[PDB]
RNA sequence: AAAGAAAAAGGAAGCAUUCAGCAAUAACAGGUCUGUG
RNA sequence: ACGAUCAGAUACCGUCGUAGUCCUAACUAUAAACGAUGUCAACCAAGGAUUGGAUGAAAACCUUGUUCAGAACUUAAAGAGAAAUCUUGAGUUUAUGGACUUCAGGG
RNA sequence: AUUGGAGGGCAAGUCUGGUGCCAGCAGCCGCGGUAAUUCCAGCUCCAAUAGUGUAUAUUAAAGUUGCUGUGAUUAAAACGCUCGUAGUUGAAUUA
RNA sequence: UUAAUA
């Protein structure tokens, strides 16, 4: 089973340093947009509410 | 001669009523001073909750009356509820 | 309720939403109008609630019918509060 | 005591119902007290 | 003074928190938040008070850094949803405050001939609804505690409580991450002038 | 020895030297040895030895219940309930919850302030199940007049002189003591005029020492 | 129906402080309210109160600060003599330093301790600890 | 609540806090007493009269332009009537209810009510004695209630 | 998904392989004072 | 009154069947006539839904906001109780007193 | 220096001789059917003491008669319901 | 279907 996938009771070094390398990855272009924003029309209320256009 | 009282007991910030020796829900806030930098001093305002206030679900906006008035909050409580 | 707000100074929006007695002084919902009859250009003074037919002061042009509540004005009648 | 809080009936401001007969022994019970279920079913049986 | 001018947020994480929807509530409102709430949504949606929510968050921030300068481990957060197993995860890295990402064991607050006998002075929860045996042990140490609650969340055992969205991954990866900055520019630890390195996406899961 | 909570580290290391400081902040106290160490030579009680039994298929379980009661004569009391097979294993069971469960008693004067104090300052009732335990003040000369299942402990929590009026099934030797724990309980708890004034901001042991524990 | 308005106010005001609410309303306002409440803000058991006016015997918004633990009235209140004081007081009040009674005097609403040093007794309205 | 019957109700009538005339009233006295008194002689009630008076003149309270009540105006221009108007409307539903149940004998909830419309004239007729109202010498009797009434 | 279940093959052995020994808490006022210095 | 069942069965089961069951007039005046919870009044923690009005929005009925009245329900770490349970009270009671009536005193 | 008692209520004996569900003790629970802490006796000591037991009655205990002060869903106990006279209780308001 | 007692 354990070479199928992993299990939850049974933890090993391997298993730890394949997650530490997987969990601290991040992407070199972070998937949060800067030049394209756009939401619904009455999102734009709280923007100009709160005082800053896009 | 010998002291009246064993102790002088703390005063819940919200209800100005005794706290008890058994009031095991009773909490203690300290929120530090910060400097003009916004990085925090040793100095602390401390505040007081009853167990039973805790317990009702309005500790929560009875402090934020008290944080309020202190000037910790601005703009949460409104004016109608600022007593 | 829980949350409690200021019991002297209500504020406009709340006063507007309470029972007409269960204000701090209790004030009527009704008011004094005046219609514009579409036959001619009198207008006649009536109370809001009335409970009666109401005709124009010049001539017997009906202006409103009285409905468990308040007077259902015609669609060609235009009003103004008295106040 | 009390084993129910509505003693085991349907009953409110009321205070008297009419009575409903049992589909198998045929007693008495009154209309709130009866265990209704309903029944829809083909005329024909599967097989 | 209590609020200094250093202390209002920057235009862009009020412009990150929209772009992760954190603002926008749950459906059925509960009284105890009825004030974050600004306005009911069009779909009848609570829309919280950002505001209020930087406000709130600031505070707790303040209380948090307070406890943690001397002894770090006296701060005790869990998260008992697995979308925030990571971020509890990575505010205790950045902290070095206990962290509990999995089930919370019935008593490791009252037990203490247990092993894991954990003495806090204070807990953050990342949900009152999933998280009320962590909420309820509080009434029982004499420990003061904050939550990240939503609309329809009971306000029961907290005492500083974060109006905002906490089911999305975007955000609760945010809240946490927003939180952690927050916490070690008090401790001075990270200049109010400069960009944190580590971004979002870390602490999301 | 060896201790495991905060407040047993604080003690033991000689910090918190009154157990007083405690009861100010309402720390719970979860080792008795702390309140050995901090007050010595307290004397005990056991009110009753009651012996309960559970049905089972073979006979009965019986087990022998233990209400004993401590407190030094200055103030301080504590009431512990334990059942164990063995009379010996039962006192010893309920004097350490005896220990866990000390309380302070307020008392004060009658009418007015010559030394020392001798009974309780108001009226306190204690509400167990159907017994309830009425305390008045008394003047110098009466002593306890109580039953002596409360009288036993009302000596221990050092209140000289006390009035009392009773009401229930007091036969109950497990409520009667209950119910008098109850109303000692809450003397400190009742808000008189003299306890108006917030008096001064004090700093809580287990934040001005947390440093020093955890390292 | 309301016999006693005394009673609806004075049940109102330990409901009040029970709950820990800062404020309470009392709808009907008497001469005999007003006076049981200057009775208790002398000895320090409330804030102050404001009587807003509205034409139908107006009501009374009374400030609570965490000391007033309960305030009750008497039912048919009795003729009370100078001799009568220390049996209502050792009955009515927690010990010798604390509580008040308060009567109706011909000299007006006053507390025990200022009734007795006037030498007159008169009707118990109620007291508060 | 209701005085026989357990129901609750509110619905009520708010004075407004002003006991002066508005301000776009500017009708006199004297025409509001000549219009009210010439109502009174169309023989129609005082709680009635007050009505039109709101409805169709705009005068909502009359104590609020002449200073004093309908009822007292009706009593110095002497269109008052001898029994009261609350007395006067409970004595012709007790006749109605009567007059029903001499073809209707079985009913037996018109017999109920019948009792209770006639307790209420009774307490009355006891009050209003007491306030001279009435003089010590009437008296309900439904063998006359009929005629007085209709 | 898991603890597991049912063929079949292989095997000397595949019902926990089969048959037994030891076998907890509490109890009977079950038999023996005619086994006992 | 029969026929079964049973040791017997004057009963449960089956068949027949008088009074009664139904309407009118008149008596009777009792029920586990129960919410086993007297009538009136004040204060009183969170909700969702419903019956009937009023009042805005949304084109008689449906969907929503507020408010009055009605029969109910859910949650409580709170209040009470011997507990079950009660919360539109069975709460606000040894911190004992809002008004009135009825009833109980071991079996 | 006597009187009453030594299982519990209630201070005081798991001492020795007889007695064997018999005699009997026992205000109440109960003890006695052959190994009686309770019967009948011997010794010892428990309480009061020139007094000490018993019986009947008053008072407290009794918040088991309630004005202070009770209880009424299930322990006993809210009239089937409404009207209703006496009785009791009755909104604010006057320098 | 029938099924009493100590």
Redesign the pocket.
Known sequence: ?IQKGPVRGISFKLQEEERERRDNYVPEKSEVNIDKITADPVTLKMLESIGMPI | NKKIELYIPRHCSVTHTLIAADDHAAVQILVPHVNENGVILPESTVYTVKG?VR??GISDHSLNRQFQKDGFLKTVVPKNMMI | ???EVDLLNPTAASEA???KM?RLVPTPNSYFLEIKCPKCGATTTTFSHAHRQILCQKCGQPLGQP????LKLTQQCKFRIKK | ??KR???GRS???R?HTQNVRCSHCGRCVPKDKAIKRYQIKNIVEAA | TNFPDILKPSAEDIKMMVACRVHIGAT????AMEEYVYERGNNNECIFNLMKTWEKLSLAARVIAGISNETPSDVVAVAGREMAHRASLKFMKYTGCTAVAGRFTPGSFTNQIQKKFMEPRLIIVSDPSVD?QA??ES?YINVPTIAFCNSDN?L??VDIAIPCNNRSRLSIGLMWWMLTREILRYQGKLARDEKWDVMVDLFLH | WTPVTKLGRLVKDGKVKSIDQIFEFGIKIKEYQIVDHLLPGLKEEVMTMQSVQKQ?S??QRTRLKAYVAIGDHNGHAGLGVKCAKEVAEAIKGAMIQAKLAMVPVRRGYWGATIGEVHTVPC???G?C??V?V?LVPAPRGTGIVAAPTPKKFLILAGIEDVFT?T??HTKTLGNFVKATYDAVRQSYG?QTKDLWKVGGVKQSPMDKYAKILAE | ?????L??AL??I???E??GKRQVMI??????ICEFLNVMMKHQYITDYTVVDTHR?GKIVVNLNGRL??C?????RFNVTLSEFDKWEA??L?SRHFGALVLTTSYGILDNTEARAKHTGGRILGFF? | ?R??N??????RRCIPYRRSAPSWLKTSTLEVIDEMCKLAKKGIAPSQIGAIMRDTHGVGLVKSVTGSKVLRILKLAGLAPKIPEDLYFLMKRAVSVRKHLEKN??DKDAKYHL??IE?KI??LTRYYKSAKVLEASFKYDANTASAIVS
């Not at chain 5, 059925?28 to 009284?31: E, R, W, Y």
């Open positions: 089973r | 039973s317990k009702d | 309720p829980l949350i939403k309470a029972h269960k409905t468990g509540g308040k | 005591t009390s809080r509505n003693n009953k409110k401001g205070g | 059925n409102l509960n009284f009320h909420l309820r009434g009971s029961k055992n | 089972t073979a006979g009226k306190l009732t509400a199940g159907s309830r009425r009026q009401t229930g009742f | 129906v309301r016999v006693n308005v009673a609806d049940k109102s330990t409901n009040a029970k709950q709808r009907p306002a008497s001469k005999v015997s633990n309960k009750a009235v008497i039912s048919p009955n009515l927690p600890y | 609540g005085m026989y357990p129901g609750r109700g509110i619905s004998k079985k009792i209770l307790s009774h307490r």
